[PDB]
Amino acid sequence: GEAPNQALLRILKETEFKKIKVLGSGAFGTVYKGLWIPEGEKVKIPVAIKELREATSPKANKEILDEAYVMASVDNPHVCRLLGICLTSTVQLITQLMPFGCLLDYVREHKDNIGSQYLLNWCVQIAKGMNYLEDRRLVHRDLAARNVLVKTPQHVKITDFGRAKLLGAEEKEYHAEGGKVPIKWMALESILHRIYTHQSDVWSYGVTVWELMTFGSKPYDGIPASEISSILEKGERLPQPPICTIDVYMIMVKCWMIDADSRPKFRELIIEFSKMARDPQRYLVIQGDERMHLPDEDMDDVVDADEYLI
């Protein structure tokens, strides 16, 4: 019962964007901060440009293109869109520049100046992003603070669609094949049976919120991933973070229930966190909260990709 996917995949010429600086590098390739300048449009768009190494396997290219396929098909304010791809000797993926980086890194770097209003807003925005993916019948399969990016301190987006799977309109579970997997973010059913669902994404949401609430701590730190599934069967979960009222923590705990259907729906998580976003000091207890404030390069013609629509 699926509608046709009429998303446009935009093919970019290399002459249309200029790389400025190197954000990061890898065997896979190097990511560049740059500007995209669409031909004859008098606009400059801050972008991140992923250029793969020429030493790339056809298995590797195949995987990245499926990621682009997913990224091109999504249109939501809390999900990263693929602007386009460039088919050069080495393939280049173009996405919206997220200047403040990884949300995991941001909370670690700024743990001193982050108040309860920001934390709850982020939980709301991530829930919306996931709720949207759920609407598109998508299962992310890798939700975690490392895969949320910061456009600005006030705006965050879900990213890393490498493990994402579309669900047949009929089907409710995706059954995986063996791979390297983010054990400590995974629903039990995923770990035991390689079963994934929107509810298994809810589990990971739960862990992702805990990362934020503990300003970037490592879940189940010092305990081997090989022992995680038994601990979960024993009924142990991550501990209540110091700043958390029982209200918030109760919500995380619900995400980690063994019966996936007993976990909350993303639309419910939206509701409950935004209720708390209204009176943040009531729900997160942070020292000197009411005092904290959170916020490089021809910027005349510069436009954010969020305002560049086609």
Binding site: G179, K180, P182, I183, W185
Partner: peptide, 7 residues
Amino acid sequence: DHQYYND
């Protein structure tokens, strides 16, 4: 220090 493990 690896998030992803085989299994």
